[PDB]
Amino acid sequence: PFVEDWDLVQTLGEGAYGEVQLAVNRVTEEAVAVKIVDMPENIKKEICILKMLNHENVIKFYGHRREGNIQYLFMELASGGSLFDRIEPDIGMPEPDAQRFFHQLMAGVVYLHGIGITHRDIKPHNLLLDERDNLKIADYSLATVFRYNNRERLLNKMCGTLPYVAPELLKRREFHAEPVDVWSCGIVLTAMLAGELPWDQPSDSCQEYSDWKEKKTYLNPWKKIDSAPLALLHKILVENPSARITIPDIKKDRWYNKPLKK
Numbered sequence: 001p002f003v004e005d006w007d008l009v010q011t012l013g014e015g016a017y018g019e020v021q022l023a024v025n026r027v028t029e030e031a032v033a034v035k036i037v038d039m040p041e042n043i044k045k046e047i048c049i050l051k052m053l054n055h056e057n058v059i060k061f062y063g064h065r066r067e068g069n070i071q072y073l074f075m076e077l078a079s080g081g082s083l084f085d086r087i088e089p090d091i092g093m094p095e096p097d098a099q100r101f102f103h104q105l106m107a108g109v110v111y112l113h114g115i116g117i118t119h120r121d122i123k124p125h126n127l128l129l130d131e132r133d134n135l136k137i138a139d140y141s142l143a144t145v146f147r148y149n150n151r152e153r154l155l156n157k158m159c160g161t162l163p164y165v166a167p168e169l170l171k172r173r174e175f176h177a178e179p180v181d182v183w184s185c186g187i188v189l190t191a192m193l194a195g196e197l198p199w200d201q202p203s204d205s206c207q208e209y210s211d212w213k214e215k216k217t218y219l220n221p222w223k224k225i226d227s228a229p230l231a232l233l234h235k236i237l238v239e240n241p242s243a244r245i246t247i248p249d250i251k252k253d254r255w256y257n258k259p260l261k262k
């Protein structure tokens with residue numbers, strides 16, 4: 001297959017609304033990623049959000065083309081693949097690499113929040129790596145505006161991935177967008193440090209969640225994580241979204257600022 005002057009050479013991945021392909025320009029050899037979407041109001045909102053993005057830890061938007069009923073969304077190709085494939089199951093990854101990925105994730109999230117955008121589905125499958133292992137937040141099909149004209153809008157739509165969602169999404173009619181992204185970044189940090197997700201969902205009927213609320217850190221995955229990043233996880237994975245640590249205070253955390261190497 002092809003799109004104008006590009007060849008669709010390989011399937012990079014897929015989601016509920018389309019598939020992502022590797023596009024190689026026949027003439028210049030420039031390699032990009034292209035989201036191919038079949039059939040309109042959702043993609044309109046997505047293209048609007050995509051054109052606002054300009055940051056080193058966010059996937060760049062190059063442009064779009066419509067060919068009949070198929071939309072092609074050209075984006076920056078991240079040649080290192082996903083953060084998901086760098087997490088060894090039941091092990092995680094070296095703490096210095098987890099910390100570097102966490103700083104870059106914070107930088108992307110501060111940027112998105114600064115321009116009034118919430119990603120709403122932060123997880124390792126959506127965190128891509130460039131050729132120098134720089135983290136890029138990808139896929140804005142669930143992203144939305146939570147601040148416009150310096151006025152915050154509370155969210156109410158259920159979305160995301162259950163092991164990564166914050167508990168207020170399940171227990172509240174309306175909720176603040178920022179604490180939700182911070183909570184999923186804590187689950188991403190747990191995954192990088194232990195290679196294991198702590199629960200199916202943070203609900204009243206989930207025993208692993210109740211175990212965390214009761215501070216049973218002698219259980220997995222918490223027992224594989226050092227006391228310093230565990231102390232930061234204790235401030236991020238707080239049930240009340242208003243008691244939960246904000247990103248300005250995550251940047252003052254002992255582990256966040258702890259020099260690490262290897």
Ligand SMILES: C[C@@]1(N2CCC(c3cc4cc(NC(=O)C5CC5)ncc4cc3Cl)CC2)COC[C@@H]1O
Nearest residue numbers: 012013014015020033077078079080081125138139
């Ligand atoms: C929906 C999900 N994906 C969300 C990101 C999505 C995507 C992929 C990409 C992969 C690469 N680079 C590489 O693959 C190089 C070869 C190693 N570069 C840019 C990409 C841009 C996007 Cl938007 C694929 C679909 C997330 O949940 C389940 C799915 O995986």
